């Protein structure tokens, strides 16, 4: 029952304005910290900022810091995000993000309705397409040991990352129990007993051990 | 490596037989600190909430334990109305929030048995009766004994959380002693479970005599 | 946030029928480090030991769980000889040393009851059996169901651990699914519990049909 | 059965050695780390020292540092401890023990044969002094650190002429076989033994412990 509306497509040519809106329903616009990632084709998801509307502080990036913009608006429970130096090098569809938490930084549970016209880990095996019947095993190391603070996303084609396992071990409800988690350290493992055409997506590494959160390159099956 | 805290959905005896349903949002092995905590709570509607008992006190072992019980309507519940706890502690660095509403997963009727013991040698005095439920879904659901039309004591009965079946649904067993006055009073004891997939009213009971 | 290991006791299942009673010293929670954790054993009276097998494995939580089962002779247990495991960790500044040795508490006798549930829509080939096992003390006690005597899979029934019941004693439930075939191949199915107060042969058993 | 027997009392004058031995039965003697405590007419009994006996290696109080010697005998499974100037105040009954343990320092083990009598920075603090015998009656003591020891806390009880028995472990668990009536609750530097109900067939010195840091010190106890 919680659903977040992002803002439609909109036409650009490097140089122009660009404001873009997400919007809330389902919880409190006020209460959790709305984020920005941005994923651009050919390249993992990486860090583009955060908002909080309850206190209407904000953070960014550390290279989006001067082209991005945040506000929100808490009457309508909206929240908007603009930029500016727009280049088609930085074509991408950003996906907004909302902070459903446990203590600092945690995992994200989010809609993805916008696109537009570093402490980082390594993503392995880079891509594999669909093998049916075989166990199929991800692997993702970071570059700072993490302890057992990684999270892991299911984007399925056209739509939002849905979230799948959270801190590497155990999984969300609804999720098959054919999806397992193990590792520690720098280490972990997503382990799927039987591979299935059933569930098809990119899958990607999530580190919220520090700033800025990071994401691995993902694996498409 | 962190505090973290739970919170319970209201039980169906206190949704729809009590109508008064108890929602508890908890903290766990918070390390004592002259730090207060606070918790506050909202609904998905952004609209008024109900004001919640707090309850403060420290536990055994030396962790502290926090509690906040908000009162809910039935029907914001049953509609699914989605409800937020707020815990902030100077402890942590950013607050912290947990969320629960209704699951619309399947839903299965659950199956009662009550069953009694014959009269066995060495205890003429006291006698054991069990109950069994079974194939329910969800894992949320309330079971008690009325004797004589009469809401027992929780201490009476003791009941076990519920667990997965072998096959299909979750089993509860609950046992319950009942003295030879009681028996002596009357002697139909009826076991019944409050579900939320049960119907009529929630409600799904069995009663069998001491002797069959 | 101290590391903890314990030791458990023999089950009288391995203890009377098997013939071979294991106790077992394991660690957990061990944050997980390169130092490999040594565990040794002895015996009170400095008699001989048996070598422990050790087998040290992670678990989902990430906490490293680390065993050494240590096969023990009957008589000398039911003489009542007190084990000692001892635990070296690197990190730890001292060893660890954990004790057992036999019960000495009263012992009661337990008592068995099989339940039998009605056959039910869409479940007709498959029914479902309840056992109960009240009064015994010490809180030793392992179950099992026989299939026209045969020993079902320690997985097929689900079973619950001892708790004290609010009198003197404990109470155990246990719930098996019965096939249809089963059934068909024999009627009388016989809920057995061992315990070291069960006499003549610490068991104590009582069957029940499907269906009359 | 698992009895430890230190030496027979001893008589002694002053600036005479003194030996006092400790024999382990009932239990591996190499294993368990052993140790010494004093307690003084004026003094709640306090930590003289420790030996491990596996290794021979030895432990010592800031004051017993320079006058009291350790030693041990693995085939005879016995402990010895051996001190030398001795004074007319330092008349006192020693109590060898147990150390069961979990890392550093915790609870303890023991039995009770110490007597000497010659011819003539963390403080426990126990409350109330004393109270009498009420049957029936819900008896409180209270025992106070000064610096926060967190849950390593320990009470013994003391019948007269024999040795401290355990009686909770980490002020929340009680050894088995004591009665439920005896409860222990507290933290940080304030802590309370309750006797829900009193009776005459456990009197004695209920004495504080304390595991958090060295030395390991005692209450002055509290007897009924
Ligand atoms: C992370 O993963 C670990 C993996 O082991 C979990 O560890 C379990 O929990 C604790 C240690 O964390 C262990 O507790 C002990 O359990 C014993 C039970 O073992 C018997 O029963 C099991 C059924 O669970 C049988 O399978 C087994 O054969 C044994 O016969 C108890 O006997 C111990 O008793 C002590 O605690 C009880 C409270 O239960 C007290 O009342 C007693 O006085 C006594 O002091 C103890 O409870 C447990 O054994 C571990 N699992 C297993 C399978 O052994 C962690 O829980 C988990 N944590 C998180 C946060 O994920
Ligand atoms: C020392 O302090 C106290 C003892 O005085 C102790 O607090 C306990 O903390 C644990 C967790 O750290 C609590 O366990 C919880 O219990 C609730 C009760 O239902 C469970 O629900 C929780 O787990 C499940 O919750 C759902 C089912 O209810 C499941 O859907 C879910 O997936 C979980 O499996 C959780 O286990 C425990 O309740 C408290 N104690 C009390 C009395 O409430 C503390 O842990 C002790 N030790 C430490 C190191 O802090």
Known sequence: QVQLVQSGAEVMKPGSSVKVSC?????????????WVRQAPGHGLEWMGEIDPGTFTTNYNEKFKARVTFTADTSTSTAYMELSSLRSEDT??????????????????FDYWGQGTEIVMTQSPATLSVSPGERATLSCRAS?????????????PGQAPRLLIYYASESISGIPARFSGSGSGTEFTLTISSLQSEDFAVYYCQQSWSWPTTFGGGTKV | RGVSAYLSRPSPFDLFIRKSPTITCLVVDLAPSKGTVNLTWSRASGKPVNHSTRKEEKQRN?????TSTL????????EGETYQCRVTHPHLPRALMRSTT?????????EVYAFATPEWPGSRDKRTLACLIQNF??????????????????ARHSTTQPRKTKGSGFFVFSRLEVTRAEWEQKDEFICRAVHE????????????????
């Open chain 1, 23 to 35: 919007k809330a329903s389902g919880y409190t616009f006020s209460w959790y910290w709305l984020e």
């Open chain 1, 92 to 109: 991408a569809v950003y996906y907004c993000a909302r902070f459903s938490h446990f203590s600092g930084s945690n995992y994200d549970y």
């Open chain 1, 144 to 156: 700072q040991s993490i302890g057992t603070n990684i999270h892991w996303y299911q984007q399925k």
């Open chain 2, 62 to 66: 030396g962790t502290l334990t926090v």
């Open chain 2, 71 to 78: 009162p809910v309507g039935t029907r914001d519940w049953i």
């Open chain 2, 102 to 110: 209704k699951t619309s997963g399947p839903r299965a009727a659950p």
């Open chain 2, 137 to 154: 879904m969800p894992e949320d659901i309330s079971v008690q004994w009325l004797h004589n039309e009469v809401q027992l004591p929780d």
């Open chain 2, 197 to 212: 997939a049960a119907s009529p009213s929630q409600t799904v009971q069995r009663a069998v005599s001491v002797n069959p």
